[PDB]
Design a protein around this ligand. Structure first.
Ligand SMILES: [Ca+2]
Length: 223
């Protein structure tokens, strides 16, 4: 997260860290046994880390649970990043409390202008590299589809939306991918891609979760 603020420990209780010996992507807990992330974060041997603030220090509220199965969307295209979404089943159910909690799925798509919360452990610089150990947060609005398509000609599908600031300076970045975009208490987006981080006229692009609710529910019900 570039241009954000320190969330505060366990103030984003649905945020997860995907760990393969190190943090490599975020995700969101949608019920006691299932996480949603980005398909481009797929790899074998994932351990899901819940209840994290500092990812390098054991602070007392963590739950570390291995994945038993990963399901990448059937129509994911790694070249265009269309359908950049993936489900992960935990080997055992997480214990839900105030600091580890699920985020609701949307019943409606959010409109441009809605303010959302984006969070992650990704790079905090637009030029250079500095990775934080504690969770960072950014408040940002959904941009109009016209502005998004103007920023990224020929690249935006109906399964994506832009959020952030055309002036730049505030954005998601590498290492935030897979993490949540939450608006009015519902999961509306997944951190997917962009051209650099926090550059003028290049906002972040996010998977549009409301298009996938039926697939998520049907997949969870039968796996
Ligand atoms: Ca920790």
């Amino acid at each position: 997260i570039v241009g954000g603020y320190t969330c505060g420990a366990n103030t984003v209780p649905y945020q997860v860290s995907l760990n393969s010996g190190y943090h490599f992507c975020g995700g969101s807990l949608i019920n006691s046994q299932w996480v949603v992330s980005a398909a481009h974060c797929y790899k074998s041997g994932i351990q899901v880390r819940l209840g994290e603030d500092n990812i390098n220090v054991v602070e007392g509220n963590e739950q570390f649970i291995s994945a038993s199965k990963s399901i990448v969307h059937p129509s994911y295209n790694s070249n265009t990043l269309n359908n950049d979404i993936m489900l992960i089943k935990l080997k055992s159910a997480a214990s839900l409390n105030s600091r580890v909690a699920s985020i609701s799925l949307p019943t409606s798509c959010a409109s441009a202008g809605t303010q959302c919360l984006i969070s992650g452990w990704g790079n905090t610089k637009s030029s250079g590299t500095s990775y934080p150990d504690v969770l960072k947060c950014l408040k940002a609005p959904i941009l109009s589809d016209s502005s998004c398509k103007s920023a990224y000609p020929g690249q935006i599908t109906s399964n994506m939306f832009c959020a952030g600031y055309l002036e730049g300076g505030k954005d998601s970045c590498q290492g935030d991918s897979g993490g949540p975009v939450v608006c009015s208490g519902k999961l509306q987006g997944i951190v997917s891609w962009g051209s650099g981080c926090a550059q003028k006229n290049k906002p972040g692009v996010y998977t549009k979760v409301c298009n996938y609710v039926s697939w998520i529910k049907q997949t969870i019900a039968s796996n």
